[PDB]
Symmetry: C3
Subunit: 282 residues, 3 copies
């Protein structure tokens, strides 16, 4: 891990002394969900490039910014653009922000992402709640906590069986009903793979047998580092596409179909998030 | 990825200006199948050592050569000796040739390899056709496409559900009948593991439950980079041994038994490949 | 692999000329089982820090020592404190001792460790014998043998289906009866994951479906390098905790509960090991 404890501090202090805002909730906007930034009030923006020790984005969208502000009466801080393993970043870079948020005072993390549908009942547009995850990269060694443990942040062997806040999962289901949506809120397991290429048919079959409901290439590292931190954790997935599960098909997965899905569910996603802010205890 | 786009170009140009040949089909000869080199006509040889930017072979067989020529009226280019992950090479080295082939003008890749038999119906000598693969290393992070994407070669998130050419799979089955072989042509899923040690009994059981038919320690990376390239892809496996699946057994897997299998199926493999060349569209 | 063959030699020679002892059996004491060191007679201690080329322990317990001596009339050598992947060590460091033991003359390796219980019949305190393992990190690339093979130690593609000595497994069962323990000796498959965080519920379910009986974050690399060496291999697991397998639970895994388990089964573990020494042929 190239980051000493001081690096985390220095980044925190720099931000603390560059904004009067003091966030409680950190939000990581997944693919095509960055619109949430609009709903914040008194929004103060900071590009990653200007933030000391921040993994400088390669050439994805060049619009990696930390947007502070208030969302439904809640001191937030949003990441509009995130880092992934498939871009070449070591997991201690992918998750460097989460520890910065902690030192800033945040005590709750909301992670959102786009993912394929493994559960056959799911459908494009659906919003699966994350009850649990399967960290395939972690089994093999790729775990953000790898290396000497910094007791200052947390313990050597933190548990993950209680990763996703039960309360939040329950309160989010409520809010959804108090929205009268046709499609019932979904809930399940999120499996992470590194990507960047898409699953073959055989691969999807594996992921289903494993018991995964949806598949993405992010989130899990951030969640793990968060939990090791003491942060409360809630998150969901926007089922942007159903994974191909038969060879007699004539369909393929593509960034187009995925971004298009994000595009439509755009505002519906924002509403849901904004409202839920009221459920986060103080 | 240590290779810039220029490196690929320079290697391509060097080859282009060092041979009058202009290949359409690239062939990667798996373990003990390198004999195919004999069947080429007007065969021009190039050792990897002399080819700029080519991963220089460690000390496997020191006979890593790129052999250009014609095979059954088809401008080929064969790799007699390939690179593996277990030898320590990063996947962007293991698959550097595939992108060189592309810039040379190749538009079809034939991958062959030796592998164990997971499907219980399989037998030593069998020739399993590859319908699909399970990229275990990829799930964890080891994917040749890892790092910044070079739009010049392909997209950021390429699909793999349609990796192995349907047409070719069908036409290869034909050719086999027009050979009157006792054993029917086999077809199935190829699972990749990094090796270099062999699967335990428990491990084989896992691979079978995953739904894999055969297991090897190569190919998948090359296929992925190929598909990201637009190349058509066909490939097969020479079931050189049945994996041990019971503890009451008294059998072990070894390079001897594997090379011996390659040795007998040697010519039979060549015939099949050479003929199929006629099925590859122009 | 940062270690040349000379490095192994130099370390061996240094030890050979620093102790009159010449071990036959090497013992790797897992978590909370390091007490075995007491039972040795004519015990000569060597801290890792003083041993050339030895992976210098970071800041776990600072008590990494190689303790030579006799155990039940058997020239031993024990590792009180081991290296793990989650601490950041490359597997060729984690397993550097095993090859040092070989050059010292050892021909048998006993590996012990603490692990969670996947098999539902298991219970805290139980002692599962290792019949086989599932090397998840290995599938993805993390295999101690990765890189150029040193024929001097062993072959390029060693088998692992016969990793755990049948004889020993049988003789250990005997010894246990000749102990009249209430709980029958357990036996099964050990699955390795890198850690350092604990499995989620979904993760445990995966490991069970894979067919694993217990889960830990070590051992497998050492075993593999041992077998590639020609060493006989025996080992067991102290089921220190049952992994959480339902979401309706209110239990978590922690280093406290694990070390506490090691603490009670402490001596019972030693007795078993010490006695078994007599079963190891000469
Ligand atoms: O089916 C899928 N498999 C793997 N990742 C994704 C994604 C997520 N969307 C992004 C690619 O569009 C990528 O960042 C990935 O994490 C959507 N659908 C799938
Ligand atoms: O049962 C098997 N498991 C894993 N690899 C292989 C192979 C292939 N053959 C080579 C070892 O002989 C190695 O390069 C591997 O990719 C044959 N049989 C098996
Ligand atoms: O349930 C478990 N999962 C993964 N590792 C362990 C362990 C072993 N104990 C250590 C953590 O207490 C760690 O070194 C690990 O290898 C005990 N129980 C479990």
């Amino acid at each position: 891990n190239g980051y000493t404890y001081e690096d985390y501090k220095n980044t925190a202090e720099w931000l603390l002394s560059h904004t009067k805002h003091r966030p409680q909730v950190a939000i990581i906007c997944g693919s095509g969900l960055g619109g949430l930034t609009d709903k914040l009030t008194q929004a103060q923006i900071f590009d990653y490039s200007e933030i000391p020790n921040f993994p400088r984005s390669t050439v994805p969208g060049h619009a990696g910014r930390l947007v502070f502000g208030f969302l439904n009466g809640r001191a937030c801080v949003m990441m509009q653009g995130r880092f992934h393993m498939y871009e070449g970043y070591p997991l201690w870079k992918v998750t460097f922000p989460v520890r910065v948020f902690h030192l800033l005072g945040v005590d709750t993390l909301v992670v959102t992402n786009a993912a394929g549908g493994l559960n056959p009942k799911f459908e494009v547009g659906d919003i699966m709640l994350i009850r649990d995850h399967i960290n395939l990269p972690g089994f093999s060694g790729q775990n953000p906590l790898r290396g000497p443990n910094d007791e200052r942040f947390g313990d050597r062997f933190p548990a993950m069986s209680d990763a996703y806040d039960r309360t939040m999962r329950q309160r989010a289901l409520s809010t959804w009903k108090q929205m009268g949506e046709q499609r019932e809120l979904q809930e399940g397991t999120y499996v992470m793979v590194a990507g960047p290429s898409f699953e073959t048919v055989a691969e999807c079959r594996v992921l289903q047998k494993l018991g995964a409901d949806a598949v993405g290439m992010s989130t899990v590292p951030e969640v793990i580092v968060a939990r090791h931190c003491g942060l409360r954790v809630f998150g969901f997935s926007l089922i942007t596409n159903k994974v191909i599960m038969d060879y007699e098909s004539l369909e393929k997965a593509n960034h187009e179909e995925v971004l298009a899905a994000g595009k439509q569910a755009a505002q519906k996603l924002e509403q849901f998030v904004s409202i839920l802010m009221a459920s986060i205890p103080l």
